[PDB]
Amino acid sequence: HHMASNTVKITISFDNYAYLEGFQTLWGFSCFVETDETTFLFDTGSNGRVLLQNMQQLDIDLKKAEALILSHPHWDHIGGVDSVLEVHPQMHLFVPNSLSKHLIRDLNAQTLGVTVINESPQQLLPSVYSTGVMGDIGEQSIVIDTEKGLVVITGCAHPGIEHIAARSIEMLQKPIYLLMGGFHLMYENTARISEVIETLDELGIQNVCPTHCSGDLAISMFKSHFGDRCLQGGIGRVITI
Amino acid sequence: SHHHHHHMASNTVKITISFDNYAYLEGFQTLWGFSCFVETDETTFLFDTGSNGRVLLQNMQQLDIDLKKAEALILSHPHWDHIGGVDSVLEVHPQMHLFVPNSLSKHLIRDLNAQTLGVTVINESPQQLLPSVYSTGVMGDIGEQSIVIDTEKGLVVITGCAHPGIEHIAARSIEMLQKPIYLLMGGFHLMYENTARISEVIETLDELGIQNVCPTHCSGDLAISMFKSHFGDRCLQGGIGRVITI
Ligand SMILES: [Mn+2]
Ligand SMILES: [Mn+2]
Ligand SMILES: [Mn+2]
Ligand SMILES: [Mn+2]
């Protein structure tokens, strides 16, 4: 009994892992989201020239995108904004208040307008919600409401992947079908990661797709724990809900 | 069997402001950030890349700056409005050497190494980078380097946003090379200082003997006005398209 999404197609378009041959791996994250109600870009990687190149090689039509959502102000997620907005300025933007006011001003003058998200969760597009800005760095994740459950996407997940999972489940009172993105576990030891995994098991996370800054150790442990419920990420990966 | 040596000081230096939130010439899009195209006797380099690499390349075309004659790219510090144009510059002209502060992400340094002629990572010690061109070394909490150009008229010190304090960057430069400062230019980060401390900054720069200033970018209109009242013609107008000849 929800106003959920019919089909959701997520394409990783920038990553430091490669799911497909023919793509330059670089540090950063970005993914292209197509639903039956909206189309949007989530983050822009560290390099907008490679990002545009990746999208041409993936047959991603950037001009079909209605909105650009930014997770947090780090170089490896806003590094492609200028290249994206040059070719497709007619977009509404959704950014966290952690972003420089100078940048927010420049973006407003270039696009259909910038919505600034605060600590309060908020719907952005049909079936697409922001967690609100969390953590000291000031990061927002996006929650997509689908028939199979929630799909949560994070940039580097600085506030803690388990706090973002729990925030999303509170917002919409549905379980999480897919938790994906960068988890920022690359500097953590084995013990800590097993605690995170088992908290994600308590919350009932059904599938995960850790990539970007998640860490080789964490990704391996996630794989051995979730098995086939742990999806291979990287540039060119396509996930359909 | 003939020997060849670089000059210690450059006889002529030409500095072109190619990205700024002030405009000196008509018909350029101001945006928050800074970039400088520097031509010396023996080398040509970029100092920072603004916040928007597409606008940066457009500004450089309109200014008849050929990016491809630049031998090096120097980054002052990791803020979005100074590294925002790096990817656009390296796509058209990757055959450059890079000089970056150690406050840059090691992930970003790794990526820049694979795409360029190589990255030199500056630490806390001052360091020569090019003929007549030195870095102060990484200063401040954010980790910002400024460049000191050795000229036959004295030192030309260029700064991105000057987070460590413009008076400390001035003093460091003078310690480095034991020459007076002919020109101190760039963003001085004096935007939210009251007139009382802008005044003690100004007279510290007077005691250091700064001969000319060009505050721009994040300097602040309050400070810029006090600077232009104190220095008169020795305070130069900044902005896109401003060409300073030494
Ligand atoms: Mn991050
Ligand atoms: Mn990241
Ligand atoms: Mn700065
Ligand atoms: Mn700045």
A61–B contact, CB cutoff 8 A:
no
For B245, list phi and psi in degrees, rounded to 5.
-105, 130
A17–B contact, CB cutoff 8 A:
no
Residues of A in contact with B110 (CB under 8 A): 27
Give the distance (Å) from ligand 3 centre to CA of residue B111: 22
Residue B82 annotated as binding site: yes
Residues 75-104 of B with CB under 8 A from A: 78, 80-81, 83-85, 87-88, 91
Token pair 């480095």 is found at B176
Comparing C-alpha atoms, which of A162, A180, A158, A196 is closest to residue A234? A180
Whole-Å CA distances, A29 to A25, A151, A226: 10, 17, 23
CATH number 2.40.110.20 is the correct assignment for the domain at A8-240: no
Tokens of B87: 């990817």
Resolution in A: 2.3
A18–B contact, CB cutoff 8 A:
no
Token pair 């072109």 is found at B16
Please answer yes or no on whether A83 and B87 come within 8 Å at the CB atom.
Answer: yes
Q: Which of A73, A79, A105 comes nearest B87 by C-beta?
A: A79
Residue B6 annotated as binding site: no
Please state, in angstroms and rounded to a whole number, the distance separating the CA atoms of residues B165 and B188: 7
Chain A and chain B share a number of CB contacts under 8 A equal to: 57
What is the DSSP code (8-state) at residue A89?
A: -
Please answer yes or no on whether A103 and B51 come within 8 Å at the CB atom.
Answer: yes
Binding residue positions of A for Mn(2+): 72, 74, 76-77, 158, 212
For B71, list phi and psi in degrees, rounded to 5.
-90, -25
Please state, in angstroms and rounded to a whole number, the distance separating the CA atoms of residues A142 and A151: 8
Q: Do B50 and B81 meet the contact criterion of CB atoms below 8 Å apart? A: yes
Q: Do B219 and B188 meet the contact criterion of CB atoms below 8 Å apart? A: yes
Residues of B in contact with A102 (CB under 8 A): 32, 81
Residues of B in contact with A83 (CB under 8 A): 53-54, 87-88
Amino acid occupying residue B173: S
Give the three-class secondary structure for B88.
Answer: helix
Give the distance (Å) from ligand 1 centre to CA of residue A32: 19
C-alpha dihedral (A226, A227, A233, A238), degrees to nearest 10: -100
Residues of B in contact with A103 (CB under 8 A): 32, 51, 80-81
For residue B8, list its beta bridge partners.
Answer: none
Please state, in angstroms and rounded to a whole number, the distance separating the CA atoms of residues B94 and A24: 15
Binding residue positions of A: 72, 74, 76-77, 158, 212
Supply angle C-alpha B145, B42, B60, rounded to 5.
70
For residue A168, list its beta bridge partners.
Answer: none
Comparing C-alpha atoms, which of B14, B55, B13 is closest to residue B34? B55
Q: Which of A49, A103, A105 comes nearest B80 by C-beta?
A: A103
Q: Cβ–Cβ contacts within 10 Å for residue B195, how many?
A: 10
Give the three-class secondary structure for A27.
Answer: coil
- Pick one of 3.60.15.10, 2.60.40.10, 3.30.565.10, 3.40.50.170 as the CATH number of B14-245: 3.60.15.10
Whole-Å CA distances, A198 to A101, A128, A194: 39, 27, 6
Give the distance (Å) from ligand 3 centre to CA of residue B95: 26
What is the helix (H) or strand (E) element at residue B233, kind and residue range? none
B55–A contact, CB cutoff 8 A:
yes
B220–A contact, CB cutoff 8 A:
no
Token pair 């060119």 is found at A236
Q: Which of A26, A48, A103 comes nearest B32 by C-beta?
A: A103
Compare all CA atoms of chain B with the CA of A102 and give the residue at the minimum distance. Answer: B32
Q: Which method, experimentally, gave rise to this model?
A: X-ray
Tokens of A224: 């051995």
Give the distance (Å) from ligand 1 centre to CA of residue A49: 20
Ligand nearest to the CA of B79: 3
Residues of B in contact with A47 (CB under 8 A): 87, 111
Give the distance (Å) from ligand 2 centre to CA of residue A43: 10
Q: Do B153 and B244 meet the contact criterion of CB atoms below 8 Å apart? A: no
On the CB side of A139, CA atoms within 13 Å amount to: 24
Listed as own residue / partner, the contacts of A50-53 with beta carbons closer than 8 Å and 24 or more positions apart are A50/A14, A50/A24, A50/A26, A50/A80, A50/B87, A51/A13, A51/A14, A51/A80, A51/A83, A51/A84, A52/A80, A52/A83, A52/A84, A52/A87, A53/A24
B111–A contact, CB cutoff 8 A:
yes
